């Protein structure tokens, strides 16, 4: 704001037009920053580089979980119905992070490739991520399911946000989705951005089925109530035969939450 008395302060922009408009000595700094911030795939087989993930092999289901809560849900519920092997991960240097982006491969029928990536992708690396994960023109038979959690102070309504009920589930489905929805769709005034939006946009523009699931929780730290709230998801053809043991999975989820991850010491 006002650094000192009487200083003229420019009005902060909203659209983003504050950006301004080269000599060789400056010509390289940009490329150094770009190479540091560039995204590369480092599938941990032997310092590999890899061409795209879907080029070497096809698949039918590519469920992706983004966010710590979604990763915990997938690592707790659907892991004991078979054995999974790792195919690769990615490395990122966003200033907000670095915590992994490892994919999973089932030793059974390989149509399922559930992913876990809690890393926060920047606002520009997402397109490169899509380019290096899918490619340019994939098949027209895949089904994509995305599970994410957002803060409750995003839903807009006439009533008070605090007065709103417990965390709930909302869905956004593309045109090419014959299956119905298990929860009411998101209202018009609310929109979603970043990686789930990029995935949904790519799926919509390339004419392949997709489905989006959101959770408007009031707490961002991982817990049991919010992850348990994802129960009604396990009733659709997107993920039906991958669940085989509910109570032991609940017990192992309780044990994982018992680890008491480092919370925030700013509050009490």
């Amino acid at each position: 704001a006002a650094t000192f008395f009487g200083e003229v302060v420019k009005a902060p922009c909203r659209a983003g037009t504050e950006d301004e408009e080269e000599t060789p000595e400056d010509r390289e700094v940009r490329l150094q920053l770009a190479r540091k911030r560039e995204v590369r795939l480092l599938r941990r087989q032997t310092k590999t580089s890899l061409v795209s993930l879907l080029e070497k092999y096809p698949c039918s289901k590519f469920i992706i979980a983004i966010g710590n809560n979604a990763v915990a849900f997938l690592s707790s519920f659907v892991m004991n119905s078979g054995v999974w092997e790792e195919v690769g991960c990615a490395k990122l240097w966003n200033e907000w992070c670095r915590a992994f982006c490892v994919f999973y491969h089932l030793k059974s029928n390989p149509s399922v490739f559930l992913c876990q990536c809690s890393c926060y992708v920047a606002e520009d690396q997402q397109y490169q991520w899509l380019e290096k994960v899918f490619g340019s023109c994939p098949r027209k038979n895949m089904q994509i399911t995305i599970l994410t959690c957002r803060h409750v102070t995003d839903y807009k309504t006439s009533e008070s946000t605090g007065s709103l009920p417990s965390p709930f589930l909302r869905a956004l489905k593309t045109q090419n989705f014959k299956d119905s929805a298990c929860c009411p769709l998101l209202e018009q005034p609310n929109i979603v951005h970043d990686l789930p939006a990029a995935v949904l946009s790519y799926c919509q523009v390339w004419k392949i089925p997709a489905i989006l699931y959101l959770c408007y929780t009031d707490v961002m730290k991982l817990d049991l109530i919010t992850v348990e709230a994802f129960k009604p998801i396990l009733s659709t053809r997107s993920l039906k035969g991958l669940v085989k043991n509910i109570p032991q999975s609940t017990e192992i989820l309780k044990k994982l939450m018992t680890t008491n991850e480092i919370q925030s010491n700013i509050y009490t």
Binding site: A1, R14, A15, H151, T153, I191, I262, S264, I266
Partner: protein, 188 residues
Amino acid sequence: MFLTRSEYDRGVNTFSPEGRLFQVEYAIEAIKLGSTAIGIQTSEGVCLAVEKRITSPLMEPSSIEKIVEIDAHIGCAMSGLIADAKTLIDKARVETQNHWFTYNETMTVESVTQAVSNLALQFGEPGAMSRPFGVALLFGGVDEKGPQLFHMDPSGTFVQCDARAIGSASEGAQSSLQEVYHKSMTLK
């Protein structure tokens, strides 16, 4: 309908739609750019071990000292920025010596962690500061209640701990400590 670029991290006193004062969170995030440290509380005293990471061989080894005396029975291990830690240490020494002169007895580790945290709480608006103290301390010592080891983070707290790292790769130095701690093992 539209996406707009709204920034709330600029400004030391700005509340984000959901709380979580961003400046203090960034100050906490800034700790990891430093040196690792460790401290174990045991029934027969406490122990500390802090790395140095000498830049060049020509630098004299004893020139840099993360370990620093506070009194005859209290020691702490700074991390992160250096000058701010020096200021905090000087204030702590002055405070404990003044208390000894006044009440004519020894310090209690909580009674000095409270003082240093109260000093560090003055971030905000007079030689008053203007930014949070991007530092961290591991106070250690022995008192009438026994041997104690206090942890003080940049924001406001002095939560008691038994073994808690502070430097980079704290996750590796925390999971292993959880796996190895016994609460009854010997000092050796």
